[PDB]
Structure 1
């Protein structure tokens, strides 16, 4: 069942990537770079999850799905780039702020991987450093990044705020599920966590980019 769910995920990612490629052929004032990012995220995630379906992307008394971290270390920084470029649409780019988000995010994912390989109190030291990184990412998202969005007009700002809330709501679920599942307190069962880390990413990757790109395309008129 776990294998079949991962095949299904990969096929959905493929369909998402094809959809974004089609959208790219009629870009409606959205730079090609934003279509490329929207395509890379699902294709990379699909390949990582395919490795799990084939029984390669995990090792074992606890089962570590290490392929998830290989996925996120590429997919999550690209999602923050998409969010940052949304705020800066039609205005000057602030690449320093964008790369600050990339740095925080990559660190966040690495701490998660190390926490998963750690035992006892050490696990929760690494987990905590990752949570602090997420908090700073959210402060940037709703603070300085949102102020850039406002400087680019009411229509863009409203779209940015919608996508920022969408992303923020989904992202807080990952460390919550992690802590409750076998990697943390073990209150939730493996099958439950597997289902969460199938459903969340579909909304986080394909769903986010549909909402993000449709909003920006609508600003063309």
Structure 2
């Protein structure tokens, strides 16, 4: 409670934990193999985020990085979370549209580059270089968003209508929410430092819960997750 952002870390921990438990109960008894994949991916996402939020709440996922002549508090646990949860969210989208394996690898690999370069930027001690890493990570994000809109055209013709509808909604949610992350980083404690860490932490909490639990609720309530069966 010594760090003002503790309240948002505590709320994030609670919301990710509750979301995990809700998806775990909702997925009980699901037998359809396709739906099992979506429940597994989508429950694993807030479960991982729960552990990383808790690690930030308890102080383990925080480190001090010297730059700008200050000791800057950097929550590195965010990147350990996103390293696994962001490819999993992309996998949800890719499986919906029955993406080619090559497209899945392009997405997951670009996503690993996005998170890894974000982590390097977050830990870099030379201030100006932090924004070089931010730019590379943003380029990887833009590549991901490009694929989400322009890499699935060969699947549109054979796509079930409920699949197309649910994918379109989830893709829109993804572009809007994922785009905000580089802005928050750029203006917050990692970047230019014009928004204080407590407000940056609130912003990431709202984004994370929306991108994980909100996304998850939209997906797991849809009939698109079930194979077409009589």
Q: TM-score, normalised by structure 1?
A: 0.90
**What residue number does 1:38 align with?**
42
Q: Supply the RMSD in Å over aligned alpha carbons.
A: 2.0
CA 1:169/1:219 → structure 2, altered by over 3 Å: closer, same or farther?
Answer: farther
- Stretches of 4+ moved more than 4 A in 1? 217-221
Aligned pair partner of 2:90 in 80, 103, 106? 80
More deviation, 17-26/196-205: 17-26
Using a 3 Å threshold, how does the CA distance of structure 1 residues 207 and 33 change in structure 2: closer, same or farther? same
Deviation, structure 1 residue 195? 0.4
Q: Is the 8 A contact 1:83 1:163 kept in 2?
A: yes
Deviation at 1:154, TM superposition (A): 3.0
1:121/1:38 CA distance change after superposition, 3 Å: same
> How far does the alpha carbon of each residue in 1:76-108 deviate from its partner, in whole angstroms, 9 at most, with x for none?
1101001111122xxxx5222112111100110
Q: How does 1:194-209 map to 2 (within 5 A)?
A: 194-209=201-216
Count of aligned pairs between the two proteins: 217
Q: Residue 179 of structure 2 corresponds to which residue in structure 1?
A: 172
The answer to whether the 8 Å contact 1:146/1:160 transfers is no
Q: Secondary structure at the match of 1:64?
A: strand
Bigger RCO of structures 1 and 2 (CA < 8 A, at least 6 apart) = 2
Q: Distance in 2 between matches of 1:146 and 1:80?
A: 17
Equivalent of 2:101, from 80, 95, 99? 95
Distance 1:146 1:16, change over 3 A: farther
Normalising by the residue count of structure 2, what TM-score does the alignment of the two structures yield? 0.87
Output the CA distance in 1 between the equivalents of 2:194 and 2:127. 16
Between the aligned partners of 1:134 and 1:170, the Cα distance in structure 2 is 12
1:156 aligned residue (140, 163, 173):
163
1:122 aligns with 129
Aligned mates of 1:210, 1:146 — CA distance in 2: 26
10-19 or 35-44, which moves further after superposition? Answer: 10-19
| Alpha-carbon separation, structure 2, partners of 1:176 and 1:52 | 21
Residues 114-138 of structure 1: per-residue CA shift (max 9 Å, x gap): 1112223321221111111111101
Judge which range, 53-62 or 113-122, deviates more.
113-122
Question: Cα offset for 1:27?
Answer: 3.3
Structure 2 alignment gaps of length 5 or more:
65-70
Gap runs ≥5 in structure 1: none
Q: State the SS of the aligned residue for 1:50.
A: helix
Deviation at 1:24, TM superposition (A): 1.6
1:141 Cα deviation after fit? 0.2
